[PDB]
């Protein structure tokens, strides 16, 4: 009899049990409404008559009635369990407003009746999941990208940087640039493909101009995508121009620093004496860091921004895509964290605003 690990993100919900090694339920973060309640895998397939809402916008929860239902679906239909038997580890976005974790507790203890619960910070977790308690996580999902300096399991609120460049925009950026090539992707079923192509084929060029150079001069970097109907689509320098946006947001007419500088900028915002620790412990997580090349490119780029002498180390746990979860599975499982929850009876005594003093 162990705990529960529910990680909620802008596009996917990752659910399972503390003391496992991998989520058991994984399903998009979508609630479907007929212009009578559909969540999960189910929800996607029905779209044509329904309306789809995503209640997690940019890592933060904006609809609470839809959020409640994703969790109704998670416990009952996906995990087949019932909450008032289990303690729940719930995850939160770096710099989640005070109010939102409060409101989160309410739902759990009140609607769901958890005997115990918790909210931890996603970044923080993935940092654990590799085995460290100091560092800076580049976490970057379907909707939002954070750089998060962590010191002794304590994220540093002054040093966090959020950038809303992430999966969905890359998906959108591949569409845009494949469409400039002639192709067309109207429908959302076609869109589901560009999503696949991005994940199947894209990578991160080491040297962006040389690469663009190479692909104008020959076709050595081309790959074909055979569409489920039979038609094969040639994809070329699109393959690395999509994830290039991460390093240069301009591609998307954004005036933002790329994930590299953003990470430099976050390291730089900290007390000087910790930086070398962070520099050398920089963890990728989120599924938008899955592109091959990323590590090196990031190694190359921070090294051009960092002290000439300095030692860098980008860590890319092969697993990273579902690391946030995992990281908490570890935690909720740890016999030494067993007596750190907020309990049903503890809530009753203090209301939601206790979720702060006990969740630092």
Choose, by CB under 6 A, the member of 73, 86, 168, 297 that binds ligand ATP. Answer: 168
Is residue 339 classed as helix, strand or coil in its secondary structure?
A: coil
CA proximity to 247, closest of 191, 291, 195, 279? 291
H/E element holding 226? Answer: strand 223-226
Q: Which is nearer to ligand ATP, 195 or 275 (CB)?
A: 195
Spatial CB neighbours of 283, under 8 Å, sequence gap ≥ 6: 126, 127, 130, 132, 135, 136, 137, 138, 315, 316, 317, 320
The β-bridge relationship of strands 223-226 and 232-235 is: antiparallel
Closer CB to ligand ATP, 70 or 278, in the complex: 70
CA 342/CA 115 separation, integer angstroms:
8
172-231: which residues touch Ca ion (CB under 5 A)? none
Q: Which of 109, 247, 251, 291 binds ligand ATP (CB under 6 A)?
A: 291
Residues numbered 307-336 forming contacts with ligand ATP, rule: CB under 6 A:
321
Specify the residue, 9 or 149, whose C-beta has the smaller distance to Ca ion. 9
Binding region for ligand ATP (CB under 6 A) out of 40-48, 256-264, 281-289, 339-347: 281-289
- Among 5, 8, 9, 61, contact with Ca ion (rule: CB under 5 A): 9
Q: Does 94 bind ligand ATP (CB under 6 A)?
A: no
- Rounded to a whole number of angstroms, the minimum distance from the CB of residue 310 to ligand ATP is 28
Say if CB 312 and CB 303 are below 8 A apart. yes
Report what 328 binds from Ca ion, ligand ATP, none; CB cut-off 5-8 Å by kind.
none
For residue 317, the minimal CB distance to ligand ATP (Å) is 13
CB of 199 to ligand ATP, least distance (A): 4
Residue 248: C-alpha distances to residues 159, 177, 263 (Å): 21, 15, 13
Residue 199 interacting partner from ligand ATP, Ca ion, none (CB closer than 5 to 8 Å by kind): ligand ATP
Total of chain residues touching Ca ion, rule CB under 5 A: 2
**CA 273/CA 294 separation, integer angstroms:** 27
- Within 10 angstroms of residue 300's Cβ, the number of other Cβ atoms is 15
Interacting residues with ligand ATP (CB under 6 A)? 9-12, 56, 59, 141-144, 166-168, 171, 195, 199, 286-288, 290-291, 321
């Amino acid at each position: 009899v162990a705990a529960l690990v529910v990680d909620n993100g802008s596009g996917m919900c990752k659910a399972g049990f503390a003391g496992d090694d991998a989520p058991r339920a994984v399903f998009p973060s979508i609630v479907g409404r007929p212009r009578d309640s559909y969540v999960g895998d189910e929800a996607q397939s029905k779209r044509g008559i329904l309306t789809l809402k995503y209640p997690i916008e940019h890592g933060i929860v904006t609809n609470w009635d839809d959020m409640e239902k994703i969790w109704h679906h998670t416990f009952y239909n996906e995990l087949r369990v019932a909450p008032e038997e289990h303690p729940v580890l719930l995850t939160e976005a770096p710099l989640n407003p005070k109010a939102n974790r409060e409101k989160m507790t309410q739902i759990m203890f009140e609607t769901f009746n958890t005997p115990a619960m918790y909210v931890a910070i996603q970044a923080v977790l993935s940092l654990y999941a590799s085995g460290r308690t100091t560092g800076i996580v580049l976490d970057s999902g379907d909707g939002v990208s954070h750089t998060v300096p962590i010191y002794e399991g304590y994220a540093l609120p002054h040093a966090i940087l959020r950038l809303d460049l992430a999966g969905r925009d890359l998906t959108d950026y591949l569409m845009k640039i494949l469409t400039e090539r002639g192709y067309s992707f109207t429908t959302t079923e076609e869109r589901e493909i560009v999503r696949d192509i991005k994940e199947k084929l894209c990578y991160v060029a080491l040297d962006f101009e040389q690469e663009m150079a190479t692909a104008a001069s020959s076709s050595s970097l081309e790959k074909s995508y055979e569409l489920k109907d039979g038609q094969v689509i040639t994809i070329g320098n699109e393959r690395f121009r999509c994830p290039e946006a991460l390093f240069q947001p301009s591609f998307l007419g954004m005036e933002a620093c790329g994930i590299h500088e953003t990470t430099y900028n976050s390291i730089m915002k900290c007390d000087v004496d910790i930086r070398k620790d962070l520099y050398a412990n920089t963890v990728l997580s989120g599924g938008t860091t899955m592109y091959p090349g990323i590590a090196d490119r990031m190694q190359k780029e921070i090294t051009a921004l960092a002290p000439s002498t300095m030692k860098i180390k980008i860590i890319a746990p092969p697993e990273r895509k579902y690391s946030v979860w995992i990281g908490g599975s570890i935690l909720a499982s740890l016999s030494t964290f067993q007596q750190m929850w907020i309990s049903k009876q503890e809530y009753d005594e203090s209301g939601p605003s206790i979720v702060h003093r006990k969740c630092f």
